[PDB]
């Protein structure tokens, strides 16, 4: 019930994670852009 993977598997997973993150960013394309002052509100 506890899982362990190799380094080659970890590396492939990091590649998957970059693409997912890229697609996550694509979802924000029409977002208002905020300054630092604006983000703390």
């Amino acid at each position: 019930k506890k899982f362990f993977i190799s380094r080659k598997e970890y590396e492939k997973i990091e590649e998957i994670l970059d693409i997912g993150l890229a697609k996550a960013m694509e979802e924000t394309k029409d977002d208002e852009l905020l300054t630092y002052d604006e983000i703390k509100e």
Binding site: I19, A22, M25, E27, T28, L33, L34
Partner: protein, 85 residues
């Protein structure tokens, strides 16, 4: 730096200890306007001007539009899986 609206939504889920590390990242590129710094930063392959910074189990997704750094996402690795594919 600029911040996509979604980044704020993303930040409400990030824990204190990571939020402190992100603040140090924001603070530094505010005066230098570069992310080059002991940062675990990499360019995302297949995309234009996209970069990933690893902060423990979180990843910050950044776009560099010319000379502007835009913080777009900050996500826990578990949450990133849903956006693939």
């Amino acid at each position: 730096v600029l911040f996509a609206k979604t980044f704020v939504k993303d930040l409400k889920h990030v824990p204190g200890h990571i939020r402190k590390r992100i603040k140090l990242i924001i603070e530094e590129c505010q005066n230098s306007n570069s992310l080059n710094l002991k940062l675990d930063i990499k360019k995302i392959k297949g995309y234009h001007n996209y970069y990933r910074i690893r902060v423990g189990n979180y990843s910050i997704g950044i776009e560099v539009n010319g000379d502007t750094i835009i913080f777009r996402r900050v996500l826990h690795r578990k949450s990133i899986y849903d956006y693939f594919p």
